[PDB]
């Protein structure tokens, strides 16, 4: 708990590696939400029941 | 670089393994393109903005 953010040269690779993971999830959510919100308008009963 | 494609019995398992990976990606692209290209006709503004 005292060391976690003090060693700058260890944190830089982590910020890059985890930042890329966070972005990948964000792009995937936008893709799925866009398809789901369009199907919702065509057939409300099916989408709501599922 | 000299060994890579000369040891025939090593390359056969690799051709099978990687051939299967390439096919899996190809089938997945056809599935996603088909859904995306239909949504594009229903709501061009939402799809283009994303």
UniProtKB/TrEMBL annotation, chains A, B:
Interval of the full protein contained in this chain: 504 to 553 of 904
What organism does this protein naturally occur in? Human herpesvirus 1 (HHV-1)
Domain of life of the source: Viruses
Could you tell me the gene encoding this protein?
UL27
Known role: Envelope glycoprotein that forms spikes at the surface of virion envelope and binds to the host cell entry receptors MYH9/NMMHC-IIA and MYH10/NMMHC-IIB, promoting the virus entry into host cells. Essential for the initial attachment to heparan sulfate moieties of the host cell surface proteoglycans. Involved in fusion of viral and cellular membranes leading to virus entry into the host cell: following initial binding to its host cell entry receptors, membrane fusion is mediated by the fusion machinery composed at least of gB and the heterodimer gH/gL.
Could you identify this protein by its name? Answer: Glycoprotein B
């Amino acid at each position: 708990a005292r060391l976690q953010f003090t060693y700058n040269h260890i944190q830089r690779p982590v910020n890059d590696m985890l930042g890329r993971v966070a972005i990948a999830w964000c792009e995937l959510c936008n893709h799925e939400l866009t398809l789901w919100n369009e199907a919702r308008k065509l057939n409300p009963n099916a989408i709501a029941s599922v």
